[PDB]
A paper describes a structure:
Here we describe ultrafast pump–probe SFX experiments on the photodissociation of carboxymyoglobin, showing that different pump laser fluences yield markedly different results. The hallmarks of MbCO photolysis are the observation of an unbound CO accompanied by changes in the iron’s spin states and position.
We performed a multitime point pump–probe TR-SFX experiment on MbCO at SwissFEL to follow the CO photodissociation process at high temporal and spatial resolution to obtain insight into the reaction mechanism. To check whether the dynamics of the system are affected by the pump laser fluence, we used four different pump laser fluences (2.4, approx. 5, 23 and 101 mJ cm−2, resulting in nominally approx. 0.3 to 12 absorbed photons/haem at the front of a crystal facing the pump laser beam, see Supplementary Table 2). To increase the relative yield of photoproduct at low laser fluence, we used smaller crystals for the 2.4 and approx. 5 mJ cm−2 data series. Of note, at 5 and 23 mJ cm−2 the apparent increase of CO* occupancy occurs with time constants of approximately 350 and 450 fs, respectively, and are reminiscent of the damping constant of a coherent nuclear oscillation of CO* that was predicted by recent computational wavepacket analysis. Since the time resolution of our experiment does not allow the predicted 1 Å amplitude, approximately 42 fs period oscillations to be resolved, they would manifest themselves simply as disorder due to distribution of the electron density over a large volume, resulting in an apparently low occupancy. As the oscillation damps, the CO* position ‘narrows’ and its apparent occupancy converges to the value observed for the respective laser fluences at approximately 10 ps. Recent quantum dynamics computations have linked the microscopic origins of ligand photolysis and spin crossover reactions in photoexcited MbCO to nuclear vibrations and predicted coherent oscillations of the Fe–CO bond distance.
Numbering used by the authors: 1 to 152
Amino acid sequence: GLSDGEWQQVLNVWGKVEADIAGHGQEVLIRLFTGHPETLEKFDKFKHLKTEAEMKASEDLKKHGTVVLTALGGILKKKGHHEAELKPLAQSHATKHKIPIKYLEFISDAIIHVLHSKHPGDFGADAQGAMTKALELFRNDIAAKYKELGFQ
Ligand code: HEM
């Protein structure tokens, strides 16, 4: 449950991401994969990436980063009214990709890390609070769908 002012902060922060969705998406995934190498194993199409240099050079990783952040941005712009947008992602990530909710926590924190890394001094405490709450809401609603599906 975010206030109007918190959603305003979220969407203000998101404008930073939308200016360079592929660069943000790439860095989010690289942060996820390098911080939590087990997550790489969930991607048949990225498990060949042995080094961060290879990850950085991967155009397909940037492409997927764009897909991920485009989806997330579409969800965030719903300001919590995202059941229709979230449902297929929860279902695909539980049933097809088999992504534990822990990895969604990892990527949520990776987003925060990337925002500070790319916008140092420009991702204020209020913005971090609002973005964190929005990612918690996202993760929590996914978690509810995971529970429905019995997925761990
Ligand atoms: C912000 C959180 C995430 C968003 C918005 C997101 C979004 C997406 C989207 C839109 C797709 C393609 C459509 C689909 O298959 O449903 C996808 C595919 C996929 N996602 Fe995610 N995802 C997120 C987090 C994760 C995490 C944390 C993992 C694993 C650690 C993961 C693993 C995968 C895999 C393996 C695929 C299939 C990739 C392929 O083979 O093309 N996702 N994701």
